């Protein structure tokens, strides 16, 4: 969710994935296919939903942590400088990236644990399976 | 006044216990020291005197006030402030004091019983943690100040503690069996 301590601010830019593996920590995983900002509350909205579906196992890996502070409008003005260090924290995701990947539970019993998680995401994803063997 | 039996009792008896391709290679005694880390709990630009004066009349040498590492940790700590003391012995004065210890030091210790075994400086070097200085052939309460303690270091070319222990004791040393 929210980081523990840091610097305080940032900026904005994009270009395709870079460190989003594939299989690892599980057999089934969910992959993001579009450039976006993933709100930390948009992850909970995913995890939590996923939990419910899984009556146990917790074999859910969320490997897209919010390494980013965004700001906002103190109400209107414009005559002041940097604003709202605290609007919210997001975690820039890029295509091919892997935010989710369950483990242990049946295909179907997974093709749903994701589907749902998809429904609260600002981007389109697609489920991936195996044959992932680069580095280890 | 020692050294022959040093070699002898040790060296020979060593090969006659070991098998050293040389006389040089056998473990020896590099140096014996005395750290006097007093003060800190006792800021006595007075007591500092008790130390050296004494330490010196017991080792026959002027030691160095191993001042503060400039460390100023939360508690009582600061820049480089006199806190402890260093007194390095080696060879003559080493041996001259050394023998005292093996003869009168520990031997003359009420409550004394010998000395723990368990290897120290796995570097074949022995460590000696002393305390009450009230067991010295040179310390006098009827001509001192207050009363303190001290630590002495055993330095030896002793490669392994195996060889260490041996040498250690051969030259003379009380082990609590």
């Amino acid at each position: 969710k929210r980081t523990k301590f840091r610097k305080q601010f940032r900026g904005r830019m994009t270009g395709d994935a870079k460190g989003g593996d594939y299989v690892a920590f599980g057999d089934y995983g969910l992959i993001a296919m579009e450039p976006a900002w993933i709100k930390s509350n948009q992850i909970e909205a995913c995890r939590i939903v996923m939990s419910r579906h899984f009556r146990r196992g917790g074999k859910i890996y969320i490997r897209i942590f919010p390494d980013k502070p965004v700001t906002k409008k103190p109400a209107e003005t414009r005559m002041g400088k940097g604003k709202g260090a605290v609007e919210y924290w997001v975690s820039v995701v890029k295509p091919g990236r892997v935010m989710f990947e369950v483990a242990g539970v049946t295909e179907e019993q997974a093709k749903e644990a994701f589907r749902l998680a998809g429904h609260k995401l600002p981007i389109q994803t697609k489920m991936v399976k195996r044959e992932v063997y680069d580095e280890a | 006044q020692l050294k022959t039996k040093y070699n002898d009792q040790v060296r020979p008896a060593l090969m006659q216990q070991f098998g050293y391709s040389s006389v040089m290679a056998v473990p020896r005694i590099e140096k014996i020291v005395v750290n006097e880390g007093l003060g800190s709990s006792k800021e006595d630009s007075k007591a500092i005197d008790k130390a050296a004066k004494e330490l010196a009349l017991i080792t026959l040498q002027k030691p160095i006030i191993t001042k503060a590492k400039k460390s100023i940790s939360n508690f009582k700590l600061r820049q480089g402030m006199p806190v402890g003391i260093k007194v390095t012995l080696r060879g003559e004065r080493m041996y001259v004091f050394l023998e005292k210890l093996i003869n009168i030091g520990l031997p003359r210790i009420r409550d004394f019983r010998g000395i723990n075994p368990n290897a120290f400086d796995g570097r074949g070097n022995y460590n000696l943690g002393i305390k009450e200085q009230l067991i010295f052939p040179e310390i006098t309460y009827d001509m001192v100040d207050k009363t303190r303690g001290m630590d002495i270091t055993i330095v030896t070319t002793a490669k392994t503690d195996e060889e260490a222990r041996a040498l250690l004791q051969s030259m003379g040393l009380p082990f609590r069996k």
């Binding site: 295509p95 483990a103 242990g104 280890a136 | -």
Partner: protein, 175 residues
């Protein structure tokens, strides 16, 4: 896998379903360019612990091994492949996957067993006889049973490159 071409220029393939790999050892690092589909259907099975027929256009069957494959992101599709020609008595080192069999005594119990490390690497495989898999006991494993390299029975010879006390599978607790 009848790969035929092998030039720096791939216009003649990039449009036409054809992957593009390279092979070698220390002698010949022949430029290459095999067919999409084929490799695609191929590597699936033999994976990287499977040497296959490499008769390049002209006919010169060669023995190699799937070393490293780098596929496109966004599109699960593979783009490049490295074939490290087989050997005879020694290749280098290989990647062999860990597998389980038989229900574990932790599953029905109250928890689920987890495979801390999917594919495992052992020192020296042994060209000609390199484990195209690795089934492992799990049953015994209860509520916190971790298995490691110092356990897994190896195929007569093969030595474990992976540090021993390293857990390959444990049976994770419930919830």
């Amino acid at each position: 896998m009848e790969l035929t071409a092998k030039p720096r220029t791939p216009k003649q393939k990039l449009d036409e379903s054809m992957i593009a790999a390279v092979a070698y050892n220390k002698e010949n690092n022949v430029s290459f360019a095999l067919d999409r589909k084929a490799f695609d259907r191929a590597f699936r099975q033999q994976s990287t612990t499977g040497l296959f027929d490499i008769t390049v256009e002209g006919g010169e069957t060669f023995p190699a091994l799937v070393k490293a494959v780098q596929m496109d992101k966004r599109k699960r599709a593979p783009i490049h492949v490295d074939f490290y020609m087989v050997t005879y008595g020694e290749p280098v080192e290989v990647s062999v996957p860990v597998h389980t069999t038989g229900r574990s005594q932790g599953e029905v119990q109250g928890g689920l067993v987890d495979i801390v490390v999917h594919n495992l690497q052992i020192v020296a495989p042994g060209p000609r006889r390199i484990p195209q898999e690795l089934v492992v006991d799990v049953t015994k494993m209860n509520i916190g049973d971790h298995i490691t390299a110092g356990d897994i029975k190896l195929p007569e010879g093969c030595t474990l490159a992976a540090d021993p006390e390293l857990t390959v599978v444990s049976v994770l607790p419930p919830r």
